[PDB]
Write an enzyme that holds these catalytic residues in place. Sequence first.
Site, PDB file in Angstrom:
ATOM      1  CG  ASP C  56       2.443  -5.054  -8.770  1.00  0.00           C
ATOM      2  OD1 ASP C  56       1.357  -5.207  -9.386  1.00  0.00           O
ATOM      3  OD2 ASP C  56       2.620  -4.187  -7.877  1.00  0.00           O
ATOM      4  CG  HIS C  58       6.800  -2.492  -8.525  1.00  0.00           C
ATOM      5  ND1 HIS C  58       6.377  -1.193  -8.685  1.00  0.00           N
ATOM      6  CD2 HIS C  58       5.796  -3.141  -7.888  1.00  0.00           C
ATOM      7  CE1 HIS C  58       5.167  -1.061  -8.169  1.00  0.00           C
ATOM      8  NE2 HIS C  58       4.791  -2.230  -7.679  1.00  0.00           N
ATOM      9  CG  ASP C  84       2.074  -1.350  -9.639  1.00  0.00           C
ATOM     10  OD1 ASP C  84       1.305  -0.410  -9.936  1.00  0.00           O
ATOM     11  OD2 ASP C  84       2.403  -1.624  -8.452  1.00  0.00           O
ATOM     12  CG  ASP C  87       7.541   4.053  -9.422  1.00  0.00           C
ATOM     13  OD1 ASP C  87       8.392   4.914  -9.747  1.00  0.00           O
ATOM     14  OD2 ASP C  87       6.312   4.222  -9.557  1.00  0.00           O
ATOM     15  CG  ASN C 116      -0.679   1.420  -7.613  1.00  0.00           C
ATOM     16  OD1 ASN C 116      -0.394   0.344  -8.162  1.00  0.00           O
ATOM     17  ND2 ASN C 116      -0.149   1.807  -6.462  1.00  0.00           N
ATOM     18  CG  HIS C 117       3.675   2.304  -8.647  1.00  0.00           C
ATOM     19  ND1 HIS C 117       4.714   2.889  -7.960  1.00  0.00           N
ATOM     20  CD2 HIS C 117       3.026   1.522  -7.752  1.00  0.00           C
ATOM     21  CE1 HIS C 117       4.700   2.477  -6.705  1.00  0.00           C
ATOM     22  NE2 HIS C 117       3.685   1.646  -6.552  1.00  0.00           N
ATOM     23  NE  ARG C 213      -2.928  -0.463  -1.825  1.00  0.00           N
ATOM     24  CZ  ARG C 213      -1.910  -1.231  -1.466  1.00  0.00           C
ATOM     25  NH1 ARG C 213      -0.924  -0.737  -0.727  1.00  0.00           N
ATOM     26  NH2 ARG C 213      -1.879  -2.494  -1.863  1.00  0.00           N
ATOM     27  CG  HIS C 240      -2.723  -2.649  -5.966  1.00  0.00           C
ATOM     28  ND1 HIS C 240      -1.861  -1.744  -6.548  1.00  0.00           N
ATOM     29  CD2 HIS C 240      -3.342  -1.985  -4.959  1.00  0.00           C
ATOM     30  CE1 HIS C 240      -1.957  -0.586  -5.920  1.00  0.00           C
ATOM     31  NE2 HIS C 240      -2.848  -0.706  -4.953  1.00  0.00           N
TER      32      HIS C 240
HETATM   33 MN   LIG Z   1       0.099  -1.414  -7.248  1.00  0.00          MN
HETATM   34 MN   LIG Z   2       2.734  -2.395  -6.681  1.00  0.00          MN
END
Ligand SMILES: [Mn+2]
Ligand SMILES: [Mn+2]
Lengths: 388, 7, 308, 582
Positions: C56, C58, C84, C87, C116-117, C213, C240
């Site tokens: 990640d 981000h 990812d 965000d 997932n983002h 989640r 993740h």
């Molecule tokens: Mn993720």
């Molecule tokens: Mn993440």
Amino acid sequence: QEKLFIQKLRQCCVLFDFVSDPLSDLKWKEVKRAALSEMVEYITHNRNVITEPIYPEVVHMFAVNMFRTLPPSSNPTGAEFDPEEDEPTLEAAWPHLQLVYEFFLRFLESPDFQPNIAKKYIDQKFVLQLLELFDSEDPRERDFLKTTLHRIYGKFLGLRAYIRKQINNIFYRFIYETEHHNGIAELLEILGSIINGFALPLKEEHKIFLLKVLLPLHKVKSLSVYHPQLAYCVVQFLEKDSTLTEPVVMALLKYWPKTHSPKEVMFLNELEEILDVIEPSEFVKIMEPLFRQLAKCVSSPHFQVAERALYYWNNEYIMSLISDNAAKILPIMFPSLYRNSKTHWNKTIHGLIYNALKLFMEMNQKLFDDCTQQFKAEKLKEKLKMKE
Amino acid sequence: XLXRXXX
Amino acid sequence: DEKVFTKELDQWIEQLNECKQLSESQVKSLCEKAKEILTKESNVQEVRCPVTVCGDVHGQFHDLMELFRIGGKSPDTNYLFMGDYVDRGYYSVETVTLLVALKVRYRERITILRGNHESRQITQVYGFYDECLRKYGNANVWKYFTDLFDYLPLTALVDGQIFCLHGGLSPSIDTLDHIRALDRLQEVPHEGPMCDLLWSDPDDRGGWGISPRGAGYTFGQDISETFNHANGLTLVSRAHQLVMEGYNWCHDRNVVTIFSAPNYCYRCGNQAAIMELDDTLKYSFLQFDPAPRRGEPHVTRRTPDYFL
Amino acid sequence: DSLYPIAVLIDELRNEDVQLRLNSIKKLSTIALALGVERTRSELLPFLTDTIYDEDEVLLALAEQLGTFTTLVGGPEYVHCLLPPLESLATVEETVVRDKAVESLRAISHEHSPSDLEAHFVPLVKRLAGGDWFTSRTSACGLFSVCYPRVSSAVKAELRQYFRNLCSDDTPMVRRAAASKLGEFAKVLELDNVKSEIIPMFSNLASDEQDSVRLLAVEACVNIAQLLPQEDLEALVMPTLRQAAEDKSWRVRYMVADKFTELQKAVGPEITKTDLVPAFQNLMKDCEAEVRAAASHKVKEFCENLSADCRENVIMSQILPCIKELVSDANQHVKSALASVIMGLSPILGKDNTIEHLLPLFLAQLKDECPEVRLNIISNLDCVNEVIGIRQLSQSLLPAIVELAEDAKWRVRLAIIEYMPLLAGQLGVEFFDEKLNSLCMAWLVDHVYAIREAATSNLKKLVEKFGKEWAHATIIPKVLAMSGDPNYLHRMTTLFCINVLSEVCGQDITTKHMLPTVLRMAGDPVANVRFNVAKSLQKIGPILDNSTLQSEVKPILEKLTQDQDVDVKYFAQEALTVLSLA
Ligand SMILES: [Mn+2]
Ligand SMILES: [Mn+2]
């Protein structure tokens, strides 16, 4: 025996000076925790009704314990952060404080303990220094302040002005100088009450407060922190006087978020709440520019927005209002609802939208068809022609 | 711890 | 004809390195050119080692910059990011643009996967959408990128031995041929295989479970062991979830989690890490703290959120 | 060939569609042009004056725009036409807007003839200053300094009054303003008025209920101090500055600390020894870290500016003792702060003292936990040897400088690596070789690239210091025993160094002991090395003789143009194109 108004007026001065610095964990000899919890239970449990002697050393004691200069924050600058996600910082040495507060509270919130006592030992300066404290220890400290101020406000008509003025200052500086303060929320709650209970015919100043201070406050980036507490004041203000509706709604639109979806939804959410109390005769003055906006929300590629706006349609009172005026409104929304709902990436709004169109038919078949008629026509030409 | 979807 | 554009890219990149966004125009082109290259890639991408696997990011652009200081720069060293990209951070745009820019450029030196983002809904709930707004005034850049995301390969296999994916295992998937079948060109579903590969986590509860989640499941050790054997895998590489230590081994060192966003969200306080797979698939982890941030200008009062 | 579009803008100036209406406004400068100057005055401005747009974003623009219309309106003779809209824009609630409004007003004020200043500008200031809304008054403050010096005695008089009334406004928001501007206003008041008018306002504001106002007073203190002659500082200033330093609000003390050296100068060399030195001590002992750190940063500069005749002493008896305490402070940033300047006292105290008093502290810092501290200390060792001995250096300091060459945090290893070349030539090649060359070779293999990179760069700087022959006899070798490393990462480091050493090792050494390995490495199974091995040849290209090139370079460079790898193929055709080998 009857020699207490010298034993207490000494049992206090003990707790006064005190000021044991709890930032080293040394000198673990309580002393004060006693004198405090002691002076509390000594005035709570029917332990008195005659301890009103001339001795406002209660104030001074409080003042010397509470009126310190709040420390530099332990949380990040801003812009790249969200206060909603700030790490709660508790004031070490809360114990002594907690009691000083709790005590002071029950202090002037007891019978026989008149106002004209403090009226001369609780001046603007006291109030002012009190206000500043409204800044960091989790509710724990703010809350007490919240309550403490409330009552001080309710018990001294000869202060109410200042308390108000000063709070406006604390607000102006917030809105236009440092976009940061830690207890707007708490301060708003106090105001909520204050607002809710004004002269039947609102005094000029209060209107100003709402417009030049209250509304412009929705402007800030950290709204997600006191939004509810604020909306309440906004509504409570309308219920007192409906007149202020047009200017209020107009303002919100004026300030409608364009780069902050969350705040956007918040606005939408706060708008319904206003409609719920919107006086019919006024739903009109706003009506047009308001819906003119809602139509834009419904079309928003941001589901949460489009959604929350679309949801205005399950509200009977609004639908009622939209009906009693369907004539002017439907043509405003229509083009955005009839707009090929098959475009969205979110296969959930088309249905959400449909539900809305539908609700319009069961309100006035004619218009709807008439609008569809127009839509389909104008859409033909601009298509037949816009192809060379 | 910010919101489960992830501090 | 070739250099004609390859220089246009080379520059774009250098600009991004100064952390200066590309124009709405350029973003559209960069993404176009990007799809054309991403289509050709399978759902289970074949990446030959050596390479460094990253987790990640981000949108924490600078820490990404630190990352490169740690593992070398592109294309001098080969990379692999497990989704990812956007965000949370304050520079999602720059971050994603730069990464995508490198893929278009050094097409064989870096490998980006979906996270997932990299989804419309999440980006709308977790920042990216708004950032794009304030940085471009409209929603086009957002659209243009979310569109590209769809074409991101869901997984990658390193030297036929290491399985790399953002999320985790899926009850709907048992063999690598299963994933290969899937049609990824579409927004991440709230349910299903694709969604699983993107939201699943390893669990200490053994055997398929319910993800706290809200999507994907929580596979256990046995599940890992089974999967690896059935496909001839020596390692399940994914990341993740925040691992306060940059990377974390689980399920009898069968699966390892790798986070690369130090002090995540500028709050979490974790360390970040990357994993190097040398000339001959040898493990090797590099942990790192968030780079030092410096800025002496006058921190002005930002333009109203109602401007536009 | 058309004047239509501009005709449209003037039209959409009332389109009631922000999006559009804004465009026109942001292009007002061109409407006005193709309009006429006489038309601008007769039509445009008025339209702008009687159309109260609401949108702040629009208003913001209108304001930034009118600040440039000095010419478009008709020159200085007519500059006073731009005031109306601005005056009103100066009252907008949203600061940003009214802020631009004032920036402009200030700007075009100078285009005003004193005559017009008095006739139209000043009145705008007064009106703004007497307004009902704090906003108006707030703005008014910034307009004083620019119009005061050029008007009449009688007007200055009135102005002075107004400004005074602003300082004593019933709103913190205004006072804070008056305060900020109190400095620039004094710079335009005649000396006496400073003494009789600024001074009062100064102290009055310096002790306002709101600490957020008092701290500003402090900054203004500097400017004022610079306006008064020495004699009058103990009578009109010091009493306040002394209070500022002791103020209950740490925020106010912080300012005094943060503008210390700035006060140091404004005040004088005497009062400094007299009042500040003591004061400066209290600040390093402040209860608020924020403040202590602030003062620390000033240690070096505050000591450098001490009056020549006392310097060495006070530093030794007053300042030095606190420093020792600060070196042990519980707050990182404080430690971290002082670790940056401390090294500066070194050449002031001289060799002997440094070794007896500072050196231990330095030593202390080279070993703190907080990287920022160690990092910050290392970076100043470039000098020390100029003060302590080259022996003392390598005696009580080199050991740490060696340990640090492998401490955890890479940024700290980086700092040492940066110091090497210096510390290297200072101690001598013979020493370097004995016990310092191995470290430089090891970093060439550090985990974090960042470091290996800096280690490579480091080599070139050493070769420059010790000689090409030394390189070909101590480094070149081990730089090749590297191309035989299973990890392409390290294998690449080889080409990387060659890319550097070549520059300064000579056509001979280069061609006789490096170019070989570069060619040999074109057969690396990893593309990365292959394309970098190509890149290297493009670097050490010009260094070789045309004979070696079109004979032993071009040939192996050709075999690369036809490689299965997309990039290797790219950098090869590239290497050729520049080396004129095609
Ligand atoms: Mn993720
Ligand atoms: Mn993440």
